[PDB]
């Protein structure tokens, strides 16, 4: 490795993405971890760990379809509109993106947004639970798993991913480039011009490779491991199709406490 015009351009690209990342996403990883580790003494979230504490935190939970699960997915997708818009604003700042065909821009984003939402959801997660209600609440992992089928299986694979993803200890500077690589995935179905997408991603990959060397001396194969997390992100998205079928094939009672339904609308 040398400091030359090529490497300097890769550092300038990393700074450009990071600055645009800060402008687009007010909920950074640093802010999330500060709440999880109990740093922010002003916003101390309330812990919801069982049905009793669920009722104790009724005030902190702020409020169509027939089935409970479908209304949850409709609600959480509606509450994810702002995040989708933020991701789209971020993609505009990726050099070369807005010059692609508009249909390919839409295709890249319509698949990319789900994976990026899961990436940022991991920031709100530790091994014990997940932040909800805009940092005002903390829903424990085991309480979610204990809920009746099929709800008890909704979030646990995302926790399993988040714990391993968070163990890589990426910061917001890393995540800015990693998210850009996700967006510029040339293997999305329906893409028209794959080559100009791959040309951009190859440059983003080079910037990511250099960023991880400079920022993470403790992990020599971090670049490989981080690209492997793409496969975990896509698997979680594909598991949503199986989830809808489990919901349709469920004959047992799928009634859920209204406060629990509102909490699931804050997840994904």
């Amino acid at each position: 490795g040398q400091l030359n015009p090529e490497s300097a351009d890769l550092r300038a690209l990393a700074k450009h993405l990071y600055d645009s990342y800060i402008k687009s996403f007010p909920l950074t990883k640093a802010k999330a971890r500060a709440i999880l580790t109990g740093k922010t003494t002003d916003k101390s979230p309330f812990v919801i760990y069982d049905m009793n504490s669920l009722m104790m935190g009724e005030d902190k939970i702020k409020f169509q379809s027939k089935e409970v699960a479908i209304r949850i997915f409709q609600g959480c997708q509606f509450r994810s509109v702002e995040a989708v818009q933020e991701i789209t604003e971020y993609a505009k700042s990726i050099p070369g993106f807005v010059n692609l065909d508009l249909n390919d821009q839409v295709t890249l984003l319509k698949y990319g947004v789900h994976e990026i939402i899961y990436t940022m959801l991991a920031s709100l997660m530790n091994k014990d639970g997940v932040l909800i209600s805009e940092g005002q609440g903390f829903m424990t992992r085991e309480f979610l798993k204990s809920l009746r089928k099929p709800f008890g299986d909704f979030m646990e694979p995302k926790f399993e991913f988040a714990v391993k993803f968070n163990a890589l200890e990426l910061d917001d500077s890393d995540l800015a480039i990693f998210i850009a690589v996700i967006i510029l995935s040339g293997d999305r179905p329906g893409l028209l011009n794959v080559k100009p997408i791959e040309d951009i991603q190859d440059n983003l990959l080079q910037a990511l490779e250099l960023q991880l060397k400079l920022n993470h001396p403790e992990s020599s194969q971090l670049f490989a491991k981080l690209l492997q997390k793409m496969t975990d992100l896509r698997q979680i998205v594909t598991e949503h199709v199986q989830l809808l079928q489990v919901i349709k094939k469920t004959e047992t009672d799928m009634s859920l406490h209204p406060l629990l339904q509102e909490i699931y609308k804050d997840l994904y």
């Binding site: 509109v81 989708v84 789209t88 604003e89 508009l102 319509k110």
Partner: peptide, 14 residues
């Protein structure tokens, strides 16, 4: 929704 998400993305790209 797939077409509902595309509409949100297309409008956001404007």
């Amino acid at each position: 929704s797939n077409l509902g998400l595309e509409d949100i993305i297309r409008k956001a790209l404007m």
